[PDB]
């Protein structure tokens, strides 16, 4: 009968769909490797999918996945066991080197652009029309670290133009230079900004940006990675 036919046909379909879904999710990170960087023996039941290409806007070129997977950077880590499956220890300074929770990716060293081709993120002092419309304005507040010591003061807010969002807080340090702090990692209070992931002595170590009126995807990743990493390594 139809009912019995329809329900079997459905399971066949569902089997094909899960096959399509799983392979689509293999466009990044594959093939699997051994802890030494070499291709693993067992790659699993599903095969890599036929490559697809994205045409990036604003003349940024194209992208094709799956494709050549390379960290394009040195990983300061070493084995702690003679067998597979154990922790890899930081050979130097985890914060400085950028491994573990403080890891970053080698994203393009260009800024994200909006629909018209203009930098997506900009400090407010350079964003025409933008202002703080609700909540406590942080500009001018002193910044405290997880060690309860003051590390600086906020001098500006970096905002997302097309999505009208505060993404970064620009902070001035004791030596007169600035740094960026992820909006999502700070706690704005009545008379101060609290940064629990970093202690006063680690703010200078935050990676800096080259241009003073724009951040690149690569710089954002280094900045964010570094600050999140403080949650584990800054405990001391």
């Amino acid at each position: 009968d139809l009912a019995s036919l329809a329900i079997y046909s459905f399971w066949i379909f569902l089997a094909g769909l899960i096959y399509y879904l799983q392979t689509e999710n293999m466009r990044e990170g594959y093939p699997l490797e051994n802890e030494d960087g070499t291709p693993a023996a067992n790659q699993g039941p599903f095969p890599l999918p036929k490559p697809k290409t994205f045409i990036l806007p604003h003349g940024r070129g194209t992208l094709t996945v799956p494709g050549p997977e390379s960290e394009d950077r040195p990983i300061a880590l070493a084995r702690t066991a003679v067998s597979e499956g154990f922790p890899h220890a930081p050979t130097g300074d985890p914060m400085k080197d950028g491994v573990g929770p403080a890891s970053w990716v080698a994203r393009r060293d260009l800024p994200e652009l909006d629909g018209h081709g203009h930098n997506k993120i900009k400090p407010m002092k350079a964003a025409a029309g933008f202002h703080v419309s609700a909540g406590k304005n942080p500009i001018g507040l002193p910044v405290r670290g997880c060690d309860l010591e003051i590390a600086g003061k906020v001098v500006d807010i970096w905002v997302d133009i097309p999505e009208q969002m505060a993404r970064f807080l620009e902070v001035e340090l004791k030596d007169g230079s600035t740094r960026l702090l992820p909006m999502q990692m700070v706690k704005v209070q009545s008379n101060r900004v609290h940064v629990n992931a970093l202690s006063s002595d680690l703010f200078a170590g935050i990676p800096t940006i080259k241009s003073p009126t724009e951040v690149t995807l690569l710089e954002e990743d280094k900045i964010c990675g570094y600050v999140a990493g403080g949650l584990m390594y800054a405990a001391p």
Partner: peptide
């Protein structure tokens, strides 16, 4: 057994109990 970008993340630490007695992976 590892994603191409996985090694840098597999560091010691983060456990709530037992320190490092059970701080390891089995396959993924």
């Amino acid at each position: 057994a590892l994603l191409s970008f996985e090694r840098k993340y597999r560091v010691p630490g983060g456990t709530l109990v037992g320190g490092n007695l059970f701080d390891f992976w089995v396959g993924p």
